[PDB]
């Protein structure tokens, strides 16, 4: 089952943050590519993730963001002072916010939401995970429909909507070098989010890349090798010691 991972290589480090309802395996191939290029990486795993869907509803985005910060702080404790934060999906929103809470050499956002119909993305993301999990449990279609019909929204999903709006409203405070990556065929979040992030950060050093044959979990999809190369080129451009 997926767990946090720590790939120790050279002195340059990347904190890898996964997506909403995702898990560390979604960023592990990126981690391995980075390791082959000499970069250390650490990937936390958010509380309640990689588990039955009700565990997400017992948790909170405030915890998940702290899980992200704990990964940064762990890299520092392990000797890595120079850290780029690279986040997939909701993790990309956490990467932007983390850069306001900790010192980073740069930021990568990959299919991160910002603006638009946030509530739709939250509920569709959760419900898709929940339905797929119940299928994996071997449940029949009626049992799944019945369990899904008993879904009760919790404070978790309202908190997530509020957290996303907070990050949107503070994105003009982001100053560190940034690469914005977006899949054109993302069916979870609106690809125009990438324009919004790019346009509204204060970062003087920024770039954006679009991927025409990819979806939301871009780091496991069919163009992942090009995504990884583009991330690498961005990393190589930064002000490392
Ligand atoms: O420790 B820190 O820099 C945090 C900033 C926001 C946090 C949350 F708990 F509200 F998510 S913790
Ligand atoms: O609305 B508030 O200022 C928030 C505090 C922490 C947030 C999270 F993004 F970590 F979840 S949002
Ligand atoms: B990527 O895994 C995401 C799916 C739904 C998201 C949110 F609702 F947070 F915007 S992010
Ligand atoms: Ca090695
Ligand atoms: Ca150590
Ligand atoms: Ca039945
Ligand atoms: Ca029904
Ligand atoms: Ca500026």
Per-residue HEC secondary structure of the chain comes to CCCCEEECCCCCEEEEECCCCCCCHHHHHHHHHHHHCCCEEEECCCCCCCCCCHHHHCCCHHHHHHHHHHHHHHHHHCCCCCEEEEEECHHHHHHHHHCCCCCCCEEEEECCCCCCCHHHHHHHHHHHHHHHHHHHCCCCHHHHHHHHHCCCCCHHHHHHHHHHHHHHHHHHHCCCCEEEEEECCCCCCCCHHHHHHHHHCCCCCEEEEEECCCCCCHHHCCCHHHHHHHHHHHHHCCCCC
- Cα–Cα distance measured from residue 88 to residue 217, given in angstroms and rounded to the nearest whole number: 7
Counting beta carbons within 10 angstroms of the beta carbon of residue 194, is it exposed (0 to 12), middle (13 to 18) or buried (19 or more)? buried
190-194 contacts, C-beta under 8 A, 24 or more apart: 190/113, 190/115, 190/116, 190/117, 190/121, 192/115, 192/116, 193/111, 193/112, 193/113, 193/114, 193/115, 193/116, 194/109, 194/111, 194/112
Which of the listed residues 113, 132, 197 should we mutate to test ligand 3's pocket, taking the one with most ligand atoms within 8 A of CB?
113
- Cα–Cα distance measured from residue 216 to residue 92, given in angstroms and rounded to the nearest whole number: 12
Breaks in the chain (C–N beyond 2.5 Å) sit after none
Question: Does the annotation count 186 as an active-site position?
Answer: yes
- Cα–Cα distance measured from residue 48 to residue 44, given in angstroms and rounded to the nearest whole number: 12
Q: Provide the edge-to-edge strand list for the sheet that holds 40-43.
A: 5-7, 40-43, 13-17, 83-88, 106-110, 178-183, 206-211
Contact of 95 with 64, CB cutoff 8 Å:
no
CA of 190 to the centre of ligand 2 (A): 21
Contact of 52 with 206, CB cutoff 8 Å:
no
Phi and psi at residue 107, in whole multiples of 5°? -135, 140
- Cα–Cα distance measured from residue 103 to residue 169, given in angstroms and rounded to the nearest whole number: 20
C-alpha to C-alpha distances, 95 to 24, 65, 90, 181, nearest whole angstrom: 15, 9, 9, 13
Question: Does the annotation count 216 as an active-site position?
Answer: yes
CB of 163 within 6 A of ligand 2: the answer is yes
- Cα–Cα distance measured from residue 204 to residue 106, given in angstroms and rounded to the nearest whole number: 12
For this experimental structure, what is the resolution in angstroms?
A: 1.4
Task: Answer positive or negative: Cα dihedral of 77, 85, 6, 35.
Answer: negative
- Cα–Cα distance measured from residue 2 to residue 235, given in angstroms and rounded to the nearest whole number: 26
Index of the ligand 3 atom closest to the CA of residue 20: 2
Does domain 5-236 bear CATH number 3.40.50.300? no
CA-wise closest residue to 109 among 186, 193, 46: 193
Lookup: tokens for 63: 């915890």
Question: Does the annotation count 241 as an active-site position?
Answer: no
């Amino acid at each position: 089952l997926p767990k946090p991972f720590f790939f120790e290589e050279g002195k340059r480090a990347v904190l890898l943050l996964h997506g909403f309802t995702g898990n560390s395996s979604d960023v592990r191939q990126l981690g391995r590519f980075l390791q082959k290029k000499g970069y250390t990486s650490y990937a936390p795993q958010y509380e309640g993730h990689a588990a039955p869907p009700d565990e997400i509803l017992k948790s909170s985005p405030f915890v998940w963001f702290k899980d992200a910060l704990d990964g940064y702080d762990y890299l520092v404790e392990q000797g890595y002072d120079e850290i780029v934060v690279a986040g997939l999906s909701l993790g990309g929103d956490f990467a932007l916010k983390l850069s306001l809470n900790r010192d980073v050499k740069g930021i990568v956002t990959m299919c991160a939401p910002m603006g638009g119909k946030t509530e739709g993305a939250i509920y569709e993301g959760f419900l898709e995970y929940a339905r797929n999990f119940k299928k994996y449990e071997g449940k029949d279609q009626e049992t799944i429909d019945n369990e899904m019909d008993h879904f009760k929204p919790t404070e978790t999903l309202k908190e997530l909507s509020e957290a996303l709006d907070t990050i949107k409203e503070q994105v003009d405070e982001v100053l560190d070098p940034i690469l914005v990556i977006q899949a054109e065929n993302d069916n979870m979040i609106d690809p125009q989010s990438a324009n919004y992030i790019y346009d509204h950060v204060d970062s003087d050093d920024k770039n954006i890349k679009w991927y025409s044959e990819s979806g939301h979990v871009i780091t496991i999809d069919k163009e992942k090798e090009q995504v990884f190369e583009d991330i690498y080129q961005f990393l190589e451009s930064l002000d490392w010691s």
